[PDB]
């Protein structure tokens, strides 16, 4: 169908940020065009997920629903970081899709657990990921895919609108507010509140983001402070200073039990498990 | 000011294409954010213009108005291609801005004149431009800047909505319709009608686009055909197959004598001289 210059793709939501990064909503993209563009580059997407202790129990639904909805037709490499390799379920995968289990060590105190995601993605992004995938996507495991999540999200760097804050003014954002923390954002600043549970971009940009947040968290620990929302607080500070080249709408990170299904979401793509 | 997620930046126009490229309108961007992003990279923009025979007379207003409105605060290199080096006016330039005169030879029949822009940008993009600028922008000389044209346009590859067609259905687009031409677009295809008078992108992408259109035009000449709108017809075919990463609205290419000042243009930035 021909794009219509004189009709907004959405009349109810913002579809591009003030720095001209697309905000990804249903009705903003033609997947057939995007699929072709990314297939021509033989794109491989790494998907990282942490499944520690009891969270191992979420892997089966997470993987089965990813097989149905995530980057279907594209090459995918799942990277499961777990303290229990044997507990990873054997989910059957479509062609061009593979999974690796990465064993997580002790931790060994709670500020170390808080830094584990940034530290381990940073470390693996610099070894394995750089030779294996084009893009890396980091999500939480206690989640299921319900609808399409595809190459429309792919870009050098992206974050996702936190479902609790997308209608909020910046004063209500739960940014780190203590100037003693590396994640400090003043009251007058902030574009959006991004959720720590869904971010990514090219391997190089994710290398940079995770190294930065891990290095900043280490500075915080040394000064005896922990940001109010841990690596999410640092993710926010990073994306304030290095603006994402796309932002995902809350279609991409929702909780229907807590937040229902408002009219502004035409699709619920990836949701918290109740 | 905080972006508002639940308010469209425009309620009257499309602000992103179906392949998630921003369409640049007033009200879609914060120039302070974009200026900073591009300054941090010390961006240099080359601006190319052809001023042949009598068109030499448009250079003075073109350059004086570019000094006021084009990429102010950024490094700029004007490249004036002319058959009359001595007729280029001495316009005084702001700091960080320079102009080079590039002498154009004979031409030496009319299909050669038709191919001169693509051929000469292609040739110079591969020598001079690649070591001298980050982005290249190609415009016509019989034009004046009236309002801001800045780093909001910068991206790997962009075209501009032709002011005569932006409200038209694709059937009305004056694409090349003969299958014997390299610029052939069938009746059922086409996203937009782009104008040949304003396109650009990174040097590498402009290298690729101009080489492709020049190579295709040479094929057409050998087969005794000339596309209905010359290098614009080929530009269109190129941007159909290699979709631009931004599209400029007609604010960026207007003719007020022919088309007035409709409500949908909040600014007229770069206009035909009457």
UniProtKB/TrEMBL annotation, chains A, B:
Major location, coarse class?
membrane
Q: Which UniProt keywords apply?
A: Glycosyltransferase, Manganese, Membrane, Metal-binding, Signal-anchor, Transferase, Transmembrane, Transmembrane helix
**Which residues make up the binding site for Mn(2+)?**
140, 142
Query: What are the positions of the active site?
Result: 232 (nucleophile)
Locations listed in the record: Membrane
| Taxonomy, superkingdom | Eukaryota
For the biological process aspect of GO, one term held by this record is: carbohydrate metabolic process
- Cofactor binding comment, as recorded: Binds 1 Mn(2+) ion per subunit.
Q: Which cofactor does it need?
A: Mn(2+)
Where, in this chain's numbering, is UDP-N-acetyl-alpha-D-galactosamine bound?
50-52, 55, 140-142
Stated name of the protein: ABO glycosyltransferase
Give the organism, scientific name: Homo sapiens (Human)
Record gene name: ABO
> Which residues of the complete protein appear here?
62 to 335 of 344
């Amino acid at each position: 169908p021909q794009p219509k210059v004189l009709t907004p793709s959405r009349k109810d939501v913002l579809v591009v940020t003030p720095w001209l990064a697309p905000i990804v909503w249903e009705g903003t993209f033609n997947i057939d065009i995007l699929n072709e563009q990314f297939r021509l580059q033989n794109t491989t997407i790494g998907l990282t997920v942490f499944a520690i202790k009891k969270y191992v129990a979420f892997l089966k639904l997470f993987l089965e629903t990813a097989e149905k909805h995530f980057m279907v037709g594209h090459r995918v490499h799942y990277y499961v970081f777990t303290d229990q390799p044997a507990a990873v379920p054997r989910v059957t995968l479509g062609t061009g899709r593979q999974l690796s289990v990465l064993e997580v060590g002790a931790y060994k105190r709670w500020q170390d657990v808080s830094m584990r995601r940034m530290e381990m993605i940073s470390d693996f992004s610099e070894r394995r990921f750089l030779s294996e995938v084009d893009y890396l996507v980091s999500v939480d495991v206690d989640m299921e895919f319900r609808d399409h999540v595809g190459v429309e999200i792919l870009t050098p760097l992206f974050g996702t609108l936190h479902p609790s804050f997308y209608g909020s003014s910046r004063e209500a954002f739960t940014y780190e507010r203590r100037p003693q923390s590396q994640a400090y954002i003043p009251k007058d600043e902030g574009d959006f509140y991004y959720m720590g549970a869904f971010f990514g971009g090219s391997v190089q940009e994710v290398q940079r983001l995770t190294r930065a947040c891990h290095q900043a968290m280490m500075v915080d620990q040394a000064n005896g402070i922990e940001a109010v929302w841990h690596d999410e607080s640092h993710l926010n500070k990073y994306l304030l200073r290095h603006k994402p080249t796309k932002v995902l709408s809350p279609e991409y990170l929702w909780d229907q039990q807590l937040l229902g299904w408002p009219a502004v979401l035409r699709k619920l793509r990836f949701t918290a498990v109740p």
